[PDB]
Amino acid sequence: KPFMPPREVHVQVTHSMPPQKIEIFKSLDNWAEENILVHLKPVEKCWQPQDFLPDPASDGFDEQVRELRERAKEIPDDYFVVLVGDMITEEALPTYQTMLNTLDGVRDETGASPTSWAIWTRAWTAEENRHGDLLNKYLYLSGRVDMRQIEKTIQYLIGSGMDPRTENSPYLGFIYTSFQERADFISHGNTARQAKEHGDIKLAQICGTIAADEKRHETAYTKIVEKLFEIDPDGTVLAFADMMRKKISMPAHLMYDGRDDNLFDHFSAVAQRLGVYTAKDYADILEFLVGRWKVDKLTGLSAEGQKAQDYVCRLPPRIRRLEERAQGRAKEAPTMPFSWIFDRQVKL
Amino acid sequence: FMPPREVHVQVTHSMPPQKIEIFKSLDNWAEENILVHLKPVEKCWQPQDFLPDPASDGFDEQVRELRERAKEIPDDYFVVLVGDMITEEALPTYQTMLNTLDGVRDETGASPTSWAIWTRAWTAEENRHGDLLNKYLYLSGRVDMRQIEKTIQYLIGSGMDPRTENSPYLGFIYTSFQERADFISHGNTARQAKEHGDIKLAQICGTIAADEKRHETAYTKIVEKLFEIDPDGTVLAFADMMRKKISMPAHLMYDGRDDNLFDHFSAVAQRLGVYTAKDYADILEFLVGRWKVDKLTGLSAEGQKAQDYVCRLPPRIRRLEERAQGRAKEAPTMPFSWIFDRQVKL
Ligand SMILES: [Fe+3]
Ligand SMILES: [Fe+3]
Ligand SMILES: [Fe+3]
Ligand SMILES: [Fe+3]
């Protein structure tokens, strides 16, 4: 069957958090306005996409665009595939603002709510917007990729949305985004350092600068979970385990270009192979968070909390060993065409 | 370095909670009268269709022709065009605006409901508008992308409160009005884009306008339906929006230099005849006729005051914001950071 995007294969579960716990967040408003909002960079001090692109109001514009394209010839298709996937993930931004606005105690109820929570969501969104913009124009000018197939993938992606399975729970929500932000920090950070190798400093600065925005986001979301562990170590420990069993699905897992039915798997494979984001990175993030939130040092947990706590502390090495042995899928990986690069083929 | 803020008290969940069912019921209906107005992905235009092709040997000359044409387009017009583009780029805010509506919100981010499906596909459609105008302005060299990017970040941080109070009634009235506004602005920049000598730019604006009409058509069929099922609540919602006035999605525009950026942008749009105080009236009047407000009967003493107010507001607005004496002729010249502080006539 033709033009059918992939769908979420799990049953939709809404409003799992007990409705009384909504007050905890109303209470933490002030706290958020002092421990969280402080991780937003004020607009006037933020970089903008133009800072890293050829200046179209400068006599230098032509040579700049020309050097950009020359450099891009020395960057192999493999890398463009990954980079394209990252950029597409970024452009599906409106979905992610919705992701935060689904959380019970934290949603923006009007579109301009004076709450600390709604203020964060809006400013976080505003920061994220520059990531897509910048990688978009870069890919556009490069000439190495097929902007029409990329634009088409993006429209499929927004139509599809995503269900991270947070069930409207600020607990699950902020656990989720804590994990994703770090993942984003690793991918972008990796494309950055790798971007230097292939011979493009400017592209490295681009990726690096996006990475730095991610760290700050991670820091912000991790202070919230930390705080939730402090206030409710039982609910939070339980929320943490729940997310992991479910597995953290990536925001663009429903990726579809109208040709490949396994586009996300394929994109990911290349990212894995290239060492941009690996099955191992997923583990390191998990382990980091376990240590960062002091899950192990938690005491006075219900028989429920204890099973959860133990599960979470012993999942990283289990995931490690298992999705370690890249025997039958790393070496014998077939070559595959991607419509994002005009059906040129790269090694999966 | 303070962005403007909504000056009105925040009013949430005004629609009676029982009326949430009306929408759950209309799911199938929506999947046959609304979703039909979305263009399937494979058949949609994409920004690359109207831009220089960067994987073509023709790229250079195409970028070069684009820039040459843009020199013949005056600063006035770039101001308006930039404002339009900025409004488009604040898209995530508008998805949120629809996700705030009580009986229609997407509860997960991927809800199989007709309502959530529409919201997501409408958003996907809108996204190409921003992308296209963005790359156009970027290649043009006529405008200061850094100041524009900064305005955009202020705008999303600010969001907007259209004062729909989570009511699908108010919501879809609102978006019915906006879509038509959008169709007029884009439509006008389109025809005017021809004058100044740029066909391609006209095709860009025109293609955006067409998207808008379809959206308008879709939102209008919902209100029509609401008038049919609940002529009282709908008539009352329609009047409520108008007293409050329909505020534009980008009214909290801020670039870090101008404290009246939206007013100023609008002034230029007005003067240029892209979107005028008169257009606002014509949209209103059209909707009054399109929804058959006047032909409504059996309304409460409440419904009737409302019905009358709405049918007599267009000419009142007309005459009033007609006489552009003290503000059209003696309009001062003002610098915009979007064009490197070059100045245009307000
Ligand atoms: Fe990002
Ligand atoms: Fe981020
Ligand atoms: Fe639009
Ligand atoms: Fe529209």
UniProtKB/Swiss-Prot annotation, chain A:
A GO molecular function held by the record: metal ion binding
Location(s) in or outside the cell: Plastid, Chloroplast; Plastid
Catalytic reaction(s) noted: octadecanoyl-[ACP] + 2 reduced [2Fe-2S]-[ferredoxin] + O2 + 2 H(+) = (9Z)-octadecenoyl-[ACP] + 2 oxidized [2Fe-2S]-[ferredoxin] + 2 H2O
Domain of life, source organism: Eukaryota
Keyword Chloroplast: yes
Record PROSITE patterns: FATTY_ACID_DESATUR_2
Record text on cofactor binding: Binds 2 Fe(2+) ions per subunit.
Tissues in which the UniProt entry reports expression: Higher levels in developing seeds than in leaf and root tissues.
Residues annotated for Fe cation 2 binding in this entry: E128, E181, E214, H217
EC number of the protein: 1.14.19.2
Binding positions (Fe cation 1): E90, E128, H131, E214
PANTHER family: ACYL- ACYL-CARRIER-PROTEIN DESATURASE-RELATED, STEAROYL-[ACYL-CARRIER-PROTEIN] 9-DESATURASE 7, CHLOROPLASTIC
Full protein name: Stearoyl-[acyl-carrier-protein] 9-desaturase, chloroplastic
